[PDB]
Curated annotation (Swiss-Prot):
Superkingdom as given in the UniProt entry: Bacteria
Designated name of the protein: Probable TonB-dependent receptor NMB0964
Pfam families: Plug (PF07715), TonB_dep_Rec_b-barrel (PF00593)
Compartment(s) where it occurs, according to its Swiss-Prot or TrEMBL record: Cell outer membrane
UniProt keyword list: Cell outer membrane, Membrane, Receptor, Signal, TonB box, Transmembrane, Transmembrane beta strand, Transport
An annotated Gene Ontology molecular function: metal ion binding
Native source organism of the sequence: Neisseria meningitidis serogroup B (strain ATCC BAA-335 / MC58)
Record's miscellaneous remark: Present in outer membrane vesicle formulations which are used as vaccines in human.
Any single GO CC term annotated in Swiss-Prot or TrEMBL for this entry: cell outer membrane
Family: Belongs to the TonB-dependent receptor family.
Lineage: Bacteria, Pseudomonadati, Pseudomonadota, Betaproteobacteria, Neisseriales
Domain TBDR beta-barrel: 126-610
Length: 610
């Protein structure tokens, strides 16, 4: 776990390796689909938000290596997330006090994408990195990833990575009378440069990262988003700052983001986000077994979103605003031999210039009976301040086709959370189970209106209104291996929410359906690793104020890897087939509930590691 400076890993946490992510999809929400707990809020082939336990947007949090993504994915699911899955070293899903180190109101879980912009190490044999290439049938995709590390002398290490994606209109099963879904194509390209130092003591690295996606918009010339993302960042960390401390960490950032929701070659809605995050973390010495780490964060996001109409005539959806976070945070764990008790805190001040104070804190205890055998309980009272969107909304959004309305008098989102989990692994039997339960004293949500003033899949109207809520659900998995050479297992998840006491007792908006999963993986022999995954997704009968029924399909995915150690590093061949039954995959979690996802599709790729 690289996200936490202080390691406070709970039983609920999990880390997917990089080699597997090259075989998975490119989008964050779609690639992480299959893992128990997280569902995909797919909005075409361009963007997809990860729905962690029926939570999304600002309720979750995504970080681009110990720093803010600087994106507008939290605004709506159609917006792309500025994180590179195919270029990342490893993705890691985390919960507990470590959530309070970065963001407020992170009730579901943190998802830090560790990338290789800055090496932080002298590469083996001078140079290192990787190269990739894969084509998907029916999409039709053309991915070409890349990554290079160069030893520029004794202690300097230069890094240069590249990526390019080109997917047309993907195929749909039994959708009226269409072979491919119109306006669902998604082209993209990503590249980054980074120069770093190497220890002892530590590293002092800079990095530039550029991205430019071009994707259509299903469900509305031709609707499409053209975005540009420039990121000027700086990372540094060493093991000996000054006496009485074990580590010093700093992650400066400047993420310039922009996207144009166009229709043909004309711009209907402009967007902008001048993020510039700064943070100074430090991990003090162990004061008798117990360890901790404190830090300060200074963030400033000058975001805005205008339309084709001028400012003099109509009020924009999101006028120019200058948000400033002045956050203080810290964590402290106490290792009592076979029992770890950790507690985090976070206090931040908001200055919305065109001043309330947030106060979050958590506490978690982890009992280890006989490692690996992790029993863990967690509870976190988190208070998230409302964004400028939730208060100052008064315009139309052409991509979703929904008029967003705000409110001048709203309170902060307080939330008393609680969750427990039991993990185990020991050759023959392996299983991870977890229960979560979230109470919200104040839960702001997009209440579908209704009139109103007058007069008005056509044109939707929403207003951010307060409400009490109560979420609860179970999630986990189990793997019984008869022989280490093979691997068999079963997984499952469930989520349920309601809204109690309005200023009654209705269901939550867009709740993911239950998904049982069957798993197989046979590695015969050594190099060739075959596998099979059957995800049975049931229908969601419990619908919200203004929603419809959603199935309810039998998903089936197969795969077959192939390792090879030749000259110039390792080679990784792989062939993956998705949805052999060709079922009509309708996702209620996403906004595009009536639109079916990609049907039958194949994949064949090669990745050279070195
Ligand atoms: Zn870092
Ligand atoms: Zn007005
Ligand atoms: Zn949008």
């Amino acid at each position: 776990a690289t996200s936490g400076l202080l390691h406070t890993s709970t039983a609920s946490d999990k880390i997917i390796s990089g080699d597997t992510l090259r075989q998975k999809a490119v989008n964050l929400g779609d690639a992480l689909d299959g893992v128990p707990g997280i569902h995909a809020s797919q909005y075409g082939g361009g963007a997809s938000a990860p729905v962690i336990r029926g939570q999304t947007g600002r309720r979750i949090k995504v970080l681009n290596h110990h720093g803010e993504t600087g994106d507008m994915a939290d605004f709506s699911p159609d917006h792309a997330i500025m994180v590179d899955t195919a270029l990342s070293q490893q993705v890691e899903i985390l919960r507990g006090p470590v959530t309070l180190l970065y963001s407020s109101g992170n009730v579901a879980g943190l998802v830090d994408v560790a990338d290789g912009k800055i090496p932080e190490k002298m590469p083996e044999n001078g140079v290192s990195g990787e190269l990739g290439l894969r084509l998907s049938s029916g999409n039709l995709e053309k991915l070409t990833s890349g990554g290079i590390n160069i030893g520029l002398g004794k202690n300097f290490v230069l890094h240069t990575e590249g990526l390019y994606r080109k997917s047309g209109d993907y195929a749909v099963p039994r959708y009226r009378n269409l072979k491919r879904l119109p306006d669902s194509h998604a082209d993209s390209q990503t590249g980054s440069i980074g120069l770093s130092w190497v220890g002892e003591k530590g590293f002092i690295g800079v990095a530039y990262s550029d991205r430019r996606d071009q994707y259509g918009l299903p469900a509305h010339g031709r609707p499409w988003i053209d975005l540009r993302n420039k990121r000027y960042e700086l990372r540094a960390e060493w093991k000996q700052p000054f006496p009485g401390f074990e580590a010093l960490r700093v992650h400066l950032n400047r993420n310039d983001y922009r996207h144009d929701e166009k229709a043909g070659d004309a711009v209907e809605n402009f967007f902008n986000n001048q993020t510039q995050n700064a943070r100074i973390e430090l991990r003090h010495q162990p004061i008798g077994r117990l360890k901790g780490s404190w830090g300060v964060q200074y963030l400033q996001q000058k975001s805005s979103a205008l339309s084709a109409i001028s400012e003099a005539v109509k009020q924009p959806m999101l006028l120019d605003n200058k948000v400033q976070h002045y956050s203080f945070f810290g964590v402290e764990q106490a290792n009592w031999d076979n029992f770890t008790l950790e507690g985090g805190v976070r206090v931040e001040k908001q200055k919305a210039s065109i001043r309330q104070t947030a106060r979050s804190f958590a506490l978690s205890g982890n009992w280890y009976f006989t490692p690996q055998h992790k029993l863990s309980l967690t509870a976190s009272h988190q208070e998230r301040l409302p964004s400028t969107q939730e208060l100052y909304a008064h315009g139309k959004h052409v991509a979703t086709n929904t008029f967003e309305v705000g409110n001048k008098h709203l309170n902060k989102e307080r939330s008393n959370n609680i969750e427990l989990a039991l993990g185990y692994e020991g050759d023959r039997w392996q299983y991870n189970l977890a229960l979560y339960r979230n109470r919200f004293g104040n839960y702001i949500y997009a209440q579908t209106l209704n009139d109103g003033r007058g007069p008005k899949s056509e044109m939707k109207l929403v207003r951010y209104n307060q409400s009490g809520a109560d979420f609860y659900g179970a999630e986990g998995e189990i793997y019984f291996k008869p022989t280490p050479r093979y691997r068999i297992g079963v997984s499952g998840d469930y989520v349920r929410g309601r809204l109690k006491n309005l200023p009654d007792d209705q269901n939550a908006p867009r709740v993911p359906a239950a998904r049982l999963g069957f798993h197989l993986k046979a590695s015969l022999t050594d190099r060739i690793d075959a596998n099979l995954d059957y995800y049975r997704v049931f229908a969601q009968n419990k619908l919200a104020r203004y929603e419809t029924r959603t199935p309810g399909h039998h998903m089936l995915n197969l795969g077959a890897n192939y390792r090879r150690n030749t000259r110039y590093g390792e080679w990784n061949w792989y062939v993956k087939a998705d949805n052999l039954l060709n079922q009509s995959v309708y996702a209620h979690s996403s906004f595009l509930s009536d639109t079916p996802q990609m049907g039958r599709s194949f994949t064949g790729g090669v990745n050279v590691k070195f």
